[PDB]
Every structure is written in C-alpha cells, then in structure tokens.
Amino acid sequence: SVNVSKLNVDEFFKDRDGTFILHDVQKDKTFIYNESRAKERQTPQSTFKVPNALIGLQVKAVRDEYDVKRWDGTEREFESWNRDHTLGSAMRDSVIWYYQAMARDIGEDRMKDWLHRISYGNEDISGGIDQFWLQSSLKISPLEEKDFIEHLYKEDLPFDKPIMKTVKRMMIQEEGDHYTLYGKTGTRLTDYGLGWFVGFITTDNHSYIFVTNVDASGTAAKNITTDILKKYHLITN
C-alpha cells in the first residue's frame, strides 16, 4: 500500500500554481504539496454544494437526493443546466440555480447558524444568501476543505447519519470494480483561474481524503487528482 509521506506530485503541477493534499485514513498521515497555498483561504465555488446539500436536507429545505426543481425555461450558459434537476443531479452537473433556490429556502439565519456550527472557513455569508460561495464573501482554505471532507467521511459532523450517507452517495464520480471515487469540483467561471476537486477514494481496506486547488478550472483540478490517484494505484478499474 502507498506510503503517502513519500508521495511526489511535482510532474502534475508543472507550469501551474496549485496545492495537493492527501490524507491516508487508516495510517493517519497527510501529504501536502505547496503548503503555502494549502493554507490560503479561497472562495469555495461549487465545492460548497457539499455543505449546502447537508444543511438543506437537514432543515428539510429539500426532501432527498431526488427532490425535483423544475427549470424556469431561461437558457443559461451550460446546456446541462437547461432542464429539470434534483439535488443529486444538480450536484453532479454543478447546477448553480438549483442550489441558489435551496439556499434561499434555507435562509440567512439558518445558513449562518449551520456554518458556525461546522466551522466552515470564514463563515462569511454577507455576499448574499444565494451568492456567498461564488467568488464572493465566503472563503475556506484547501486544508480546511480537507478537514471538512474528512469530518464528512468519518461522520464527525452534527448531521443525521443517513443525511451524510446520502450526500456522500451524491458525490460518487466513478464506481469501479476495485475503487469508488467521490468528489466535488468547483470553478471560478469568470476567468477559469481558480479550480477545486475535493473528496475521497475507497479501495479494499484503504481510504484517502484529497483536496486539489489550482489556478485552473475545476476539470483541470479533477484531472490532476485522478492522475495522482492512478499513479499510486488507487484508481485502477
């Protein structure tokens, strides 16, 4: 099994400004590439869909991963956004409008209370109930994102356990024969100059929490992550 203290990911960050964090759950060891950036609080983008979904389910703003919100008919920038969505499909396709509707239903008071309860970054929602995670007031460091995802993995958060199971299932990106990859991307869609992929991977007898944060798109962040996990024989088939 991989010894994360001996990782090297230099080849995947050439000509990039990024950080990579990998935590071995069973061996309780953490590798960090670019610790300075790992400590820098940044806007979470669609990585906020993870805590947003937990809170929205917990307060019954939405019923389950299948809660349908009908598309209003307005053509938006991405084709995948221009159809009816559910909590789960809107996570998979980063459908901002769905999560904005849910955030408005959660409301400022409950959102503030929950972000304080889970100590999510600077907890700053002053940018607006349906805007604060989108290159706005809320900021969280890559290491803080790793801690949050690790708490979700271990279910050391103050949510009902079935809600945490549901949201983790909504994060499934690839279900192979020998591994399951969970994750959420985020991108700053103005310049595509801030990108995230946060999540975890399970194999037989091993699991790992990861965060990639980079001066590129969320897709680039995800591809860097999967390249690293493949290199170390965690993503196989």
Task: Determine the longest span between alpha carbons in the chain, in angstroms.
Answer: 51
CB 211 within 8 A of CB 39: no
CATH number at residue 178: 3.40.710.10
Experimental method, per PDB record: X-ray
In a domain, 38, yes or no: yes
94: left (phi over 0), alpha (psi -120 to 50) or beta: left
| Selection from 173, 152, 155, 145 nearest residue 229 by Cα | 173
In a domain, 123, yes or no: yes
Distances (CA, A) of 86 to 10, 64, 67, 214, 231: 38, 9, 5, 29, 34
Number of domains in the chain: 1
Q: Catalytic residues, which ones?
A: 46
How crowded is residue 7: how many other Cβ atoms within 10 Å of its Cβ? 18
Residue 41 CB-density burial (10 A; 0-12 exposed, 13-18 middle, 19+ buried) = middle
Handedness of CA 113, 118, 119, 123 (dihedral sign): negative
Residue numbers of the domain that contains 18: 4-231
User: Which tokens in the block code for residue 187?
Assistant: 């991108």
Instruction: Show the 3-state SS of the chain.
Output: CCCHHHCCCHHHHCCCCEEEEEEECCCCEEEEECHHHHCCCECCHHHHHHHHHHHHHHCCCCCCCCCEECCCCCCCCCHHHCCCEEHHHHHHCCCHHHHHHHHHHHCHHHHHHHHHHCCCCCCCCCCCCCCCCCCCCCCECHHHHHHHHHHHHHCCCCCCHHHHHHHHHHCEEEECCCEEEEEEEEECCCCCCCEEEEEEEEECCEEEEEEEEECCCHHHHHHHHHHHHHHCCCCCC
CB 35 within 8 A of CB 21: no
In a domain, 160, yes or no: yes
User: Which tokens in the block code for residue 10?
Assistant: 């230099």
In a domain, 236, yes or no: no
In a domain, 237, yes or no: no
Q: For the CA atoms of the chain, what is the radius of gyration?
A: 17
| Selection from 180, 185, 152, 148 nearest residue 168 by Cα | 152
In a domain, 89, yes or no: yes
CA atoms of 39 and 48, how far apart (whole Å): 18
Q: How many residues in total does the chain contain? A: 237
